Amino acid sequence: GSINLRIDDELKARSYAALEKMGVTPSEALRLMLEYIADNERLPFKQTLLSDEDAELVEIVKERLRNP
Amino acid sequence: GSINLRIDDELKARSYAALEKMGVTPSEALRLMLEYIADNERLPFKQTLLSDEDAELVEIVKERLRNPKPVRVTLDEL
Amino acid sequence: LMLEYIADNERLPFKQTLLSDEDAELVEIVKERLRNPKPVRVTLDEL
Amino acid sequence: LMLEYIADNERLPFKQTLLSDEDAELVEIVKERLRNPKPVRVTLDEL
Amino acid sequence: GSINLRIDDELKARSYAALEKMGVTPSEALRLMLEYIADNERLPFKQTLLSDEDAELVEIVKERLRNPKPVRVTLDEL
Amino acid sequence: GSINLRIDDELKARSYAALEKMGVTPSEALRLMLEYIADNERLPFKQTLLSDEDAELVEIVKERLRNP
Amino acid sequence: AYFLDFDERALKEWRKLGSTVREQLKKKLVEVLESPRIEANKLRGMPDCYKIKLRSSGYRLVYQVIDEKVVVFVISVGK
Amino acid sequence: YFLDFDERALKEWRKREQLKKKLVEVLESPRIEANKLRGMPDCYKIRSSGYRLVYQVIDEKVVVFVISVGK
Amino acid sequence: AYFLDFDERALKEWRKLGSTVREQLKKKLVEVLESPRIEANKLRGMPDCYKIKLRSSGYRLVYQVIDEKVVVFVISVGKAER
Amino acid sequence: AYFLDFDERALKEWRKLGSTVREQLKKKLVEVLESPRIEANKLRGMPDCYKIKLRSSGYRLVYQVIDEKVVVFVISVGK
Amino acid sequence: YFLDFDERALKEWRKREQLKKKLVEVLESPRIEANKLRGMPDCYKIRSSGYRLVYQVIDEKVVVFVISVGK
Amino acid sequence: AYFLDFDERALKEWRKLGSTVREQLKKKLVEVLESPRIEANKLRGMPDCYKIKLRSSGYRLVYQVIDEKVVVFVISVGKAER
């Protein structure tokens, strides 16, 4: 198969530059993310949005454990 | 710009399925990763290969700190 | 057996979560006051 | 009371330090093998 | 070079006592600290004043992440 | 009282430079260390020499907990 | 759909499993190969290592998940 | 296990069938490590609705203590 | 670079900075926007939060980096405490 | 020989201690002022904070040790 | 508490009066948090000589398990 | 700068590096000697140990910083594993 990606010119530059430094090809990089996403049903990035939602739930528990 | 990615047929199927469930387009996903890599200079995955390389480095440090044999030196000696 | 534990340790084998959220109260008053500290140097005579 | 714990949790209230230094054995064989890894890709057919 | 330090009489007493117990000369102790400060750009003591400054920064972050109100902006807006 | 310290010229430079950045005077810095040492009977630096002696004691315990 | 790597030692151990026991481990490996991170089987003390545990027999498989290569790396098989 | 409710949590509950269905499973063997609210002592969470109940398990009194119910 | 989000409170605080102080905070912000994780400025006690510190003035900016959206989320701007 | 700072609130609390109770807290404060870090009284959850605990009465003092200013900072007094 | 010795530790012991004096205090209330050998589960250390004994306290069997004696 | 100690094993390893590779390790060592704690190169799992990494060649130097003696203690030099 094949995928065609619309990409900003400057981002093509900086991301490819970085990939050469890492010694990973752009195709390998993108096929990893797609395989990951396919198997884990999520993005590989830190779930900090969900993370600091839990942190606020804890802040409410804390306040309530002060005077039960 | 534009990128052409050669992709296995089944992986296109499975990843597209997954992306739709998430409501993320294949382009948005890939543009996040490329932007991340560009700014952070690493893949967004857990750096576990690097992690267990250090683990063995730690193992050599541990073994050697059992009977340390320090030698004070200058750069000119090196 | 459990008695032999409580004999020596002078506590229960379970985790003292009651003291956990009693030391959390203190931390709170401390965390709160560290926000607005008002330090004052004192002779022990001045106590 | 302690019985009511062991009833539900299906373990002892004390900390299972025996499983601690049983999982340490495994970690060892794993830490050791991660030193000299010898990876081999396998069809599940090839199993 | 040379440094002259003005020191309280009792502190000279007590610190010298302590230094002898350790078998460290007053000069060696002070030359360690000056070298540390020069290279690390901080005092060798626990940075607890900075620690509980961050603790309050964390407290403001926590309070604000309860009801976050993000606004996407560009630098030119700033 | 007074203390006279013999100091390498280059170190006087770099350490004073750094102290100005930190907004701490050289006299304050040295009086802190002396007071600390006087009260704690140790240097304010990390006790990493003692720290990695304990780490090796642990390494021996670990090996022995393998086959008791 | 992660790739599967076996350490050679892990593969040698595997070869001398009873036909019965490897059949049931294999049934759980394929579940693992799709979504490899099971929070309950986390081998505490090592990066990204997990167990596969058998009710009967008491045999144990240990694998590490390497997301950056999308592989599940089988390190140990035995008891 | 015993079941305790904080006064605030009970006010939330009043304003439920499916959660209660999960609570009785919680009441026998209360520690489900997968729902561990990490960052807090002995606290845990309980598909649809996206509503969240939070309880603490106290080994020394065999109670499940429901502290919060909502979103 | 990462996208830039400001919390409403943070933007209000930003507005009433001296032209000079926001000028230097801004200049370090554009650097942050292309490499937001400076582990040295890591704000311990909250997920993925970091500081921007000004030597003079003593002002502090706090942002959280949200990788999943490639945004830097500026939460607080000011100088807490005396 | 650390310096002693009291938070104003801590000092106000102190003012309304029984003459008896502050006398015994004070006896432990002066022990603290020389070698302030007692590993057993570490208030877990906050940087460098320690307790002074009284057998009788059950009153508690909380202080933080700031090595960089060689001060013991008394934050809380009460029960 | 019960007292167990590992075989290696006992070989060390043979090659003692002051340590034994501290062991009986250890045998009743074994957890002295100040001598915690940090970095290890439930392990602790026991002025002169600079010799070190290391033992582990196992709550589930009420034993003090002396693993190492020496320098 | 901090003093420099090499373990005997580490010095033996150093000796049999190509003139080029020890040349570039040395150049990063003099930088380390004046600011030995690069938290980014922090070797987690041991007290105060840090890495020096070479992009090419892939060689690794590991040192521990002992502040109480202001020394950098180079423990290992090589490339472990494949």
Author numbering:
A (entry chain A), F (entry chain A): 2 to 69
B (entry chain B), E (entry chain B): 2 to 79
C (entry chain C), D (entry chain C): 33 to 79
G (entry chain F), J (entry chain F): 2 to 80
H (entry chain D), K (entry chain D): 3 to 17, 23 to 53, 56 to 80
I (entry chain E), L (entry chain E): 2 to 83
From the study:
The antitoxin, RelB, both binds and inhibits RelE, and regulates transcription through operator binding and conditional cooperativity controlled by RelE. RelB is additionally known to dimerize through formation of a ribbon-helix-helix (RHH) DNA binding motif that allows transcriptional autoregulation through binding to the relO operator region (Li et al., 2008; Overgaard et al., 2009).
In this work, we describe the crystal structure of the intact E. coli RelB2E2 TA complex determined to 2.8 Å resolution, corresponding to the fully RelE-saturated complex. The structure covers most of RelE (residues 2–80 of 95) and one molecule of RelB (residues 2–79 of 79), whereas the other two RelB molecules lack either the C terminus (residues 2–69) or N terminus (residues 33–79) due to poor electron density. In the RelBE complex structure, each RelE tightly binds the C-terminal region of its associated RelB (residues 50–79) through displacement of helix α3 (Li et al., 2009). Two neighboring RelB molecules dimerize at their N termini to form a RHH-type DNA binding motif that closely resembles the structure of the isolated dimerization domain determined by nuclear magnetic resonance (NMR) (Li et al., 2008). To understand the proposed model in structural terms, we used the structure of DNA-bound Arc to analyze the consequences of binding of the complete RelB2E2 tetramer to DNA. Structural alignment of two complete RelB2E2 tetramers with their RelB dimerization domains in adjacent major grooves immediately suggests why the complex cannot bind at high RelE concentrations: Due to the close proximity of the binding sites on DNA, binding of two adjacent tetramers generates an overlapping, W-shaped complex in which the two RelE molecules at each end of the complex (denoted as RelE and RelE′ in Figure S2A) clash.
